[PDB]
Amino acid sequence: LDFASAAYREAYSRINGVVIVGEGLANRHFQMLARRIPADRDELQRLGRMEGDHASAFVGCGRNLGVVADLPLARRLFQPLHDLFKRHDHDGNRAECLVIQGLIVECFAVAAYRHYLPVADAYARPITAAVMNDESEHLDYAETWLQRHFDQVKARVSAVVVEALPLTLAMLQSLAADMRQIGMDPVETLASFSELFREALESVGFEAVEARRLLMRAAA
Numbered sequence: 001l002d003f004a005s006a007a008y009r010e011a012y013s014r015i016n017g018v019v020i021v022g023e024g025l026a027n028r029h030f031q032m033l034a035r036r037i038p039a040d041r042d043e044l045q046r047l048g049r050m051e052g053d054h055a056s057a058f059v060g061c062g063r064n065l066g067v068v069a070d071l072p073l074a075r076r077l078f079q080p081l082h083d084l085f086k087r088h089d090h091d092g093n094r095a096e097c098l099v100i101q102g103l104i105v106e107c108f109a110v111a112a113y114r115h116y117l118p119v120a121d122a123y124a125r126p127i128t129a130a131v132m133n134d135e136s137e138h139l140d141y142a143e144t145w146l147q148r149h150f151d152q153v154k155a156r157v158s159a160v161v162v163e164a165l166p167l168t169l170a171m172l173q174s175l176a177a178d179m180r181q182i183g184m185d186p187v188e189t190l191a192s193f194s195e196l197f198r199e200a201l202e203s204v205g206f207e208a209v210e211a212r213r214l215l216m217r218a219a220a
């Protein structure tokens with residue numbers, strides 16, 4: 001792939017834009033969670049600050065390429081998912097907020113970065129791999145909490161998953177053409193997401209059979 005080509009730099013502006021905004025929103029999400037899970041306020045605030053650092057790292061990746069990131073477009077694609085999160089926050093639905101940011105968004109980030117890594121430029125590759133090392137800490141928090149409460153939350157989790165997964169699938173469809181132009185296979189990226197996200201649901205308490213069902217539902 002030619003990093004100087006028009007097709008690459010245009011698609012890159014948009015994928016980098018989504019990454020930058022998404023990391024931004026992950027920061028905002030953890031801060032909202034911190035102010036509703038007082039027991040782990042310090043921890044959640046550190047995780048949020050981690051997201052801040054991820055955002056500025058990816059800001060630098062685009063500046064290394066000399067591409068301006070399309071932040072307006074990213075703000076637009078993220079609005080349905082962020083609203084859904086803002087609605088759960090507003091009703092004190094900390095469980096559903098944790099599934100959205102902590103499992104769904106985190107697993108999408110991991111899937112995306114896994115597929116970007118082998119086609120990333122030499123500046124971006126180390127940074128990307130380090131960011132990937134951080135996201136397990138984010139996943140473990142959400143998995144631990146949700147596991148501890150599995151019994152009270154299970155139904156609410158299944159339901160928020162059904163609401164949320166479609167929004168992230170719409171984002172992916174929108175971005176699939178750009179992902180191809182920067183060397184990511186959006187089909188294989190989605191597959192990786194599915195594997196990761198099933199591992200996460202398992203890890204909470206869902207039966208392997210139930211994990212697959214809840215996903216396939218959301219697919220169809």
Ligand SMILES: [Fe+3]
Binds near residue numbers: 023051
């Ligand atoms: Fe992050």
Ligand SMILES: [Fe+3]
Binds near residue numbers: 026106109138
């Ligand atoms: Fe994260």
